[PDB]
Design a protein around this ligand. Sequence first.
Ligand SMILES: *[B]([O])([O])C1=[C]C2=C([C]=[C][C]=[C]2)S1
Length: 356
Amino acid sequence: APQQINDIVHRTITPLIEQQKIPGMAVAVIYQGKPYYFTWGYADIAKKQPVTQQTLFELGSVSRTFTGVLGGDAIARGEIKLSDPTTKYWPELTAKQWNGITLLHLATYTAGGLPLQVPDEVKSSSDLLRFYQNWQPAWAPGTQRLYANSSIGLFGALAVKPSGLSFEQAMQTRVFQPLKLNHTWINVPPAEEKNYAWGYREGKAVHVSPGALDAEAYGVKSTIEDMARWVQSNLKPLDINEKTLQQGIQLAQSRYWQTGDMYQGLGWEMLDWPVNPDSIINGSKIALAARPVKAITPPTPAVRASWVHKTGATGGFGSYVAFIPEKELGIVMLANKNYPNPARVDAAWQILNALQ
Ligand SMILES: *[B]([O])([O])C1=[C]C2=C([C]=[C][C]=[C]2)S1
């Protein structure tokens, strides 16, 4: 890497690791198109395995960027429309609170207060139907945003229904494969287990537990290389050959709703560039934050002058991705500790600001 990239990265990440006591980390900087990789520490403390460019990390909610794009790809194929009622794709959802709730509402957390978590008690699929039927919205659709696995997760599951493909099969075929993300998995194959980092929570090695709608909301594991390729694809969608996938990327970076300085896409969240990190932090320690939203009518197509980003966490991992299309610049930070979001954003901002 250019010494300038080397120096900003090392000066920022070294103190981060020390301060947050992160066991292992991988970072990619995308700079004028090309990726530069950096790794530190341990994928597996007990077995003394280092983090490498092939190490798999749990992305947590960064998985929603994939769900958003796969939804966008289904829209572009004409399989679904965001303006359609949820009940068009799930006819058994006959409870009257569902009248007026569209796939757009699910994708953007605006359905009227769907809960942050699907309950653990929800094992089977009829449990899942029962959960959504019995749910009582606090608000009318399209009035408030409440970040929720149950909202984006349902969007993911329903988006792939017309295809007839399982969510995993649709994701593999329509997103991972075309983009050459060959080390990106919803379920880690036995062949790749050697590379699956452990997460660390209170000193203990942990992996994310199975849960309803896990794949759709928080279930993807990836390497720093595949994540850099993902950022490249999102920086330059119009260079992707598969037409519907190209459209799907642009649809996921469209601005549907505004809360403060933040805009909600499908999975991705965006702010106008330039922006101060105080704004990035604040517009992204709170278990539940209900925020009124203003509809962007109609949605703004992907703005190149944006800070486009997503944070991600599981019990044992913390991830962050941010890019600025106008500057052909991006970063991915993957760690096997869930450490505070403000520290992730600060570090990413320090790096990208220095390089632009
Ligand atoms: B994502 O990394 O923001 C997630 C947030 C939660 C997940 C699972 C359970 C509760 C919150 S994934």
